[PDB]
mmCIF file of all heavy atoms in Angstrom:
data_model
loop_
_atom_site.group_PDB
_atom_site.id
_atom_site.type_symbol
_atom_site.label_atom_id
_atom_site.label_comp_id
_atom_site.label_asym_id
_atom_site.label_seq_id
_atom_site.Cartn_x
_atom_site.Cartn_y
_atom_site.Cartn_z
ATOM 1 N N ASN A 1 -40.576 56.468 -96.559
ATOM 2 C CA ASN A 1 -40.903 56.794 -95.171
ATOM 3 C C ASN A 1 -41.429 58.227 -95.127
ATOM 4 O O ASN A 1 -40.642 59.178 -95.088
ATOM 5 C CB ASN A 1 -39.689 56.619 -94.270
ATOM 6 C CG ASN A 1 -39.378 55.165 -93.985
ATOM 7 O OD1 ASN A 1 -38.426 54.604 -94.527
ATOM 8 N ND2 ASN A 1 -40.184 54.545 -93.131
ATOM 9 N N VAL A 2 -42.752 58.369 -95.135
ATOM 10 C CA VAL A 2 -43.416 59.657 -94.972
ATOM 11 C C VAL A 2 -44.503 59.507 -93.916
ATOM 12 O O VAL A 2 -45.213 58.495 -93.880
ATOM 13 C CB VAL A 2 -44.004 60.183 -96.300
ATOM 14 C CG1 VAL A 2 -42.896 60.439 -97.306
ATOM 15 C CG2 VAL A 2 -45.016 59.202 -96.873
ATOM 16 N N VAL A 3 -44.617 60.503 -93.042
ATOM 17 C CA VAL A 3 -45.599 60.496 -91.963
ATOM 18 C C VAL A 3 -46.276 61.858 -91.910
ATOM 19 O O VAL A 3 -45.599 62.891 -91.867
ATOM 20 C CB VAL A 3 -44.954 60.162 -90.604
ATOM 21 C CG1 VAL A 3 -45.952 60.371 -89.476
ATOM 22 C CG2 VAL A 3 -44.433 58.734 -90.596
ATOM 23 N N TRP A 4 -47.606 61.859 -91.913
ATOM 24 C CA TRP A 4 -48.393 63.068 -91.725
ATOM 25 C C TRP A 4 -48.987 63.057 -90.323
ATOM 26 O O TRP A 4 -49.623 62.077 -89.921
ATOM 27 C CB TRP A 4 -49.504 63.172 -92.771
ATOM 28 C CG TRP A 4 -49.003 63.229 -94.182
ATOM 29 C CD1 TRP A 4 -48.568 64.333 -94.854
ATOM 30 C CD2 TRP A 4 -48.892 62.133 -95.097
ATOM 31 N NE1 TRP A 4 -48.189 63.993 -96.130
ATOM 32 C CE2 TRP A 4 -48.378 62.648 -96.303
ATOM 33 C CE3 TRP A 4 -49.174 60.767 -95.013
ATOM 34 C CZ2 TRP A 4 -48.141 61.844 -97.415
ATOM 35 C CZ3 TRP A 4 -48.939 59.972 -96.118
ATOM 36 C CH2 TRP A 4 -48.429 60.512 -97.303
ATOM 37 N N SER A 5 -48.782 64.142 -89.587
ATOM 38 C CA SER A 5 -49.209 64.245 -88.199
ATOM 39 C C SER A 5 -50.178 65.412 -88.037
ATOM 40 O O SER A 5 -50.440 66.169 -88.974
ATOM 41 C CB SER A 5 -48.002 64.410 -87.271
ATOM 42 O OG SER A 5 -47.309 65.614 -87.548
ATOM 43 N N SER A 6 -50.718 65.545 -86.829
ATOM 44 C CA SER A 6 -51.598 66.652 -86.492
ATOM 45 C C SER A 6 -50.769 67.894 -86.171
ATOM 46 O O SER A 6 -49.534 67.867 -86.176
ATOM 47 C CB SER A 6 -52.499 66.274 -85.321
ATOM 48 O OG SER A 6 -51.732 65.856 -84.206
ATOM 49 N N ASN A 7 -51.453 69.005 -85.897
ATOM 50 C CA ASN A 7 -50.738 70.222 -85.517
ATOM 51 C C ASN A 7 -49.955 70.039 -84.223
ATOM 52 O O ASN A 7 -48.766 70.400 -84.194
ATOM 53 C CB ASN A 7 -51.718 71.400 -85.445
ATOM 54 C CG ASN A 7 -51.015 72.742 -85.352
ATOM 55 O OD1 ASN A 7 -49.786 72.816 -85.339
ATOM 56 N ND2 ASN A 7 -51.796 73.813 -85.290
ATOM 57 N N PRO A 8 -50.529 69.501 -83.129
ATOM 58 C CA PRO A 8 -49.674 69.032 -82.033
ATOM 59 C C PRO A 8 -49.301 67.570 -82.220
ATOM 60 O O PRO A 8 -50.180 66.710 -82.327
ATOM 61 C CB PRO A 8 -50.546 69.248 -80.793
ATOM 62 C CG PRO A 8 -51.940 69.076 -81.293
ATOM 63 C CD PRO A 8 -51.958 69.421 -82.767
ATOM 64 N N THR A 9 -48.005 67.270 -82.267
ATOM 65 C CA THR A 9 -47.539 65.910 -82.487
ATOM 66 C C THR A 9 -46.470 65.558 -81.464
ATOM 67 O O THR A 9 -45.734 66.423 -80.984
ATOM 68 C CB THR A 9 -46.993 65.722 -83.912
ATOM 69 O OG1 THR A 9 -46.564 64.366 -84.086
ATOM 70 C CG2 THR A 9 -45.830 66.662 -84.174
ATOM 71 N N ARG A 10 -46.402 64.271 -81.131
ATOM 72 C CA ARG A 10 -45.492 63.767 -80.111
ATOM 73 C C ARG A 10 -44.650 62.647 -80.699
ATOM 74 O O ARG A 10 -45.191 61.676 -81.237
ATOM 75 C CB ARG A 10 -46.263 63.254 -78.892
ATOM 76 C CG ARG A 10 -46.608 64.321 -77.872
ATOM 77 C CD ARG A 10 -47.532 63.770 -76.798
ATOM 78 N NE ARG A 10 -47.585 64.634 -75.625
ATOM 79 C CZ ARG A 10 -48.352 65.710 -75.522
ATOM 80 N NH1 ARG A 10 -49.155 66.082 -76.506
ATOM 81 N NH2 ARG A 10 -48.315 66.429 -74.405
ATOM 82 N N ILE A 11 -43.331 62.776 -80.593
ATOM 83 C CA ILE A 11 -42.409 61.723 -80.992
ATOM 84 C C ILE A 11 -41.657 61.271 -79.749
ATOM 85 O O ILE A 11 -41.319 62.087 -78.883
ATOM 86 C CB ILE A 11 -41.443 62.178 -82.108
ATOM 87 C CG1 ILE A 11 -40.261 62.963 -81.545
ATOM 88 C CG2 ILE A 11 -42.172 63.048 -83.115
ATOM 89 C CD1 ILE A 11 -39.221 63.327 -82.579
ATOM 90 N N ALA A 12 -41.443 59.963 -79.635
ATOM 91 C CA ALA A 12 -40.810 59.369 -78.461
ATOM 92 C C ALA A 12 -39.503 58.721 -78.891
ATOM 93 O O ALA A 12 -39.511 57.652 -79.510
ATOM 94 C CB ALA A 12 -41.735 58.352 -77.796
ATOM 95 N N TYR A 13 -38.387 59.361 -78.558
ATOM 96 C CA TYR A 13 -37.065 58.823 -78.849
ATOM 97 C C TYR A 13 -36.736 57.735 -77.827
ATOM 98 O O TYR A 13 -37.592 57.297 -77.053
ATOM 99 C CB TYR A 13 -36.033 59.947 -78.859
ATOM 100 C CG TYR A 13 -34.832 59.689 -79.741
ATOM 101 C CD1 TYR A 13 -34.975 59.522 -81.112
ATOM 102 C CD2 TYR A 13 -33.554 59.628 -79.204
ATOM 103 C CE1 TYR A 13 -33.879 59.291 -81.922
ATOM 104 C CE2 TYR A 13 -32.452 59.397 -80.005
ATOM 105 C CZ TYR A 13 -32.620 59.230 -81.363
ATOM 106 O OH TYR A 13 -31.526 59.000 -82.165
ATOM 107 N N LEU A 14 -35.483 57.276 -77.819
ATOM 108 C CA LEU A 14 -35.078 56.259 -76.854
ATOM 109 C C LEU A 14 -35.196 56.776 -75.425
ATOM 110 O O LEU A 14 -35.697 56.072 -74.541
ATOM 111 C CB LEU A 14 -33.651 55.797 -77.144
ATOM 112 C CG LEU A 14 -33.502 54.632 -78.124
ATOM 113 C CD1 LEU A 14 -33.673 55.097 -79.561
ATOM 114 C CD2 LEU A 14 -32.159 53.948 -77.934
ATOM 115 N N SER A 15 -34.745 58.008 -75.181
ATOM 116 C CA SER A 15 -34.865 58.636 -73.870
ATOM 117 C C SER A 15 -35.337 60.081 -73.983
ATOM 118 O O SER A 15 -35.187 60.853 -73.030
ATOM 119 C CB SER A 15 -33.536 58.575 -73.114
ATOM 120 O OG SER A 15 -33.711 58.915 -71.749
ATOM 121 N N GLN A 16 -35.904 60.459 -75.125
ATOM 122 C CA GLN A 16 -36.348 61.821 -75.372
ATOM 123 C C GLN A 16 -37.768 61.806 -75.917
ATOM 124 O O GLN A 16 -38.159 60.883 -76.638
ATOM 125 C CB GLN A 16 -35.422 62.542 -76.361
ATOM 126 C CG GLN A 16 -33.973 62.640 -75.913
ATOM 127 C CD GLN A 16 -33.737 63.775 -74.938
ATOM 128 O OE1 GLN A 16 -34.668 64.480 -74.549
ATOM 129 N NE2 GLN A 16 -32.485 63.958 -74.536
ATOM 130 N N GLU A 17 -38.538 62.827 -75.556
ATOM 131 C CA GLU A 17 -39.869 63.052 -76.104
ATOM 132 C C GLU A 17 -39.932 64.480 -76.625
ATOM 133 O O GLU A 17 -39.428 65.404 -75.977
ATOM 134 C CB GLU A 17 -40.953 62.783 -75.051
ATOM 135 C CG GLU A 17 -41.055 63.828 -73.955
ATOM 136 C CD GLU A 17 -39.962 63.699 -72.904
ATOM 137 O OE1 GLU A 17 -38.957 63.001 -73.154
ATOM 138 O OE2 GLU A 17 -40.106 64.306 -71.825
ATOM 139 N N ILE A 18 -40.518 64.655 -77.806
ATOM 140 C CA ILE A 18 -40.499 65.931 -78.508
ATOM 141 C C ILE A 18 -41.928 66.310 -78.866
ATOM 142 O O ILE A 18 -42.708 65.465 -79.317
ATOM 143 C CB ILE A 18 -39.627 65.865 -79.780
ATOM 144 C CG1 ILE A 18 -38.220 65.367 -79.448
ATOM 145 C CG2 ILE A 18 -39.556 67.226 -80.452
ATOM 146 C CD1 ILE A 18 -37.476 66.228 -78.478
ATOM 147 N N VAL A 19 -42.272 67.579 -78.663
ATOM 148 C CA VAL A 19 -43.569 68.118 -79.050
ATOM 149 C C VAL A 19 -43.344 69.261 -80.030
ATOM 150 O O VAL A 19 -42.498 70.133 -79.797
ATOM 151 C CB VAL A 19 -44.385 68.589 -77.832
ATOM 152 C CG1 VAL A 19 -44.897 67.392 -77.055
ATOM 153 C CG2 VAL A 19 -43.547 69.487 -76.938
ATOM 154 N N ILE A 20 -44.091 69.246 -81.130
ATOM 155 C CA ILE A 20 -44.025 70.282 -82.151
ATOM 156 C C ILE A 20 -45.396 70.932 -82.246
ATOM 157 O O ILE A 20 -46.413 70.237 -82.351
ATOM 158 C CB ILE A 20 -43.582 69.725 -83.518
ATOM 159 C CG1 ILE A 20 -42.289 68.910 -83.395
ATOM 160 C CG2 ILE A 20 -43.391 70.860 -84.509
ATOM 161 C CD1 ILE A 20 -42.482 67.433 -83.102
ATOM 162 N N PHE A 21 -45.422 72.262 -82.204
ATOM 163 C CA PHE A 21 -46.669 73.019 -82.147
ATOM 164 C C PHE A 21 -46.526 74.228 -83.062
ATOM 165 O O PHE A 21 -45.800 75.171 -82.736
ATOM 166 C CB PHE A 21 -46.979 73.445 -80.712
ATOM 167 C CG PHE A 21 -48.355 74.009 -80.526
ATOM 168 C CD1 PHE A 21 -49.468 73.318 -80.977
ATOM 169 C CD2 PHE A 21 -48.540 75.218 -79.881
ATOM 170 C CE1 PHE A 21 -50.737 73.831 -80.800
ATOM 171 C CE2 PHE A 21 -49.807 75.735 -79.699
ATOM 172 C CZ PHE A 21 -50.907 75.040 -80.159
ATOM 173 N N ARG A 22 -47.215 74.199 -84.202
ATOM 174 C CA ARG A 22 -47.087 75.231 -85.225
ATOM 175 C C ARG A 22 -48.291 76.164 -85.156
ATOM 176 O O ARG A 22 -49.410 75.776 -85.508
ATOM 177 C CB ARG A 22 -46.950 74.601 -86.611
ATOM 178 C CG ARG A 22 -47.354 75.506 -87.768
ATOM 179 C CD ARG A 22 -46.388 76.664 -87.945
ATOM 180 N NE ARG A 22 -46.958 77.706 -88.789
ATOM 181 C CZ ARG A 22 -47.063 78.981 -88.440
ATOM 182 N NH1 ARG A 22 -46.632 79.413 -87.267
ATOM 183 N NH2 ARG A 22 -47.616 79.842 -89.288
ATOM 184 N N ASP A 23 -48.051 77.389 -84.682
ATOM 185 C CA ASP A 23 -49.007 78.493 -84.720
ATOM 186 C C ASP A 23 -48.360 79.764 -84.178
ATOM 187 O O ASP A 23 -47.199 79.743 -83.757
ATOM 188 C CB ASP A 23 -50.284 78.164 -83.941
ATOM 189 C CG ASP A 23 -50.022 77.855 -82.485
ATOM 190 O OD1 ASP A 23 -48.841 77.793 -82.087
ATOM 191 O OD2 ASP A 23 -51.004 77.693 -81.732
ATOM 192 N N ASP A 24 -49.099 80.868 -84.182
ATOM 193 C CA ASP A 24 -48.586 82.163 -83.755
ATOM 194 C C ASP A 24 -48.985 82.433 -82.310
ATOM 195 O O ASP A 24 -50.147 82.245 -81.936
ATOM 196 C CB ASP A 24 -49.104 83.275 -84.665
ATOM 197 C CG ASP A 24 -50.582 83.132 -84.975
ATOM 198 O OD1 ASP A 24 -51.156 82.068 -84.657
ATOM 199 O OD2 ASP A 24 -51.169 84.079 -85.538
ATOM 200 N N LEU A 25 -48.020 82.870 -81.504
ATOM 201 C CA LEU A 25 -48.241 83.163 -80.092
ATOM 202 C C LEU A 25 -47.954 84.608 -79.722
ATOM 203 O O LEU A 25 -48.650 85.170 -78.871
ATOM 204 C CB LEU A 25 -47.372 82.251 -79.208
ATOM 205 C CG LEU A 25 -47.862 80.846 -78.850
ATOM 206 C CD1 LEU A 25 -49.154 80.902 -78.049
ATOM 207 C CD2 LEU A 25 -48.026 79.982 -80.081
#
């Protein structure tokens, strides 16, 4: 089980949604 995603990625849990954003702010 390996998954490659984009820099902004969205995962949808049973009742949760998560966004991961890797860069400098």
Side-chain angles (χ1 to χ4, degrees):
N1 285 105
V2 297
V3 171
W4 299 276
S5 63
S6 56
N7 192 0
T9 181
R10 274 172 164 82
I11 82 175
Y13 207 62
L14 271 78
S15 193
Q16 301 279 2
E17 72 283 15
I18 306 300
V19 287
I20 308 89
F21 190 51
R22 157 69 195 126
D23 59 355
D24 44 349
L25 276 298

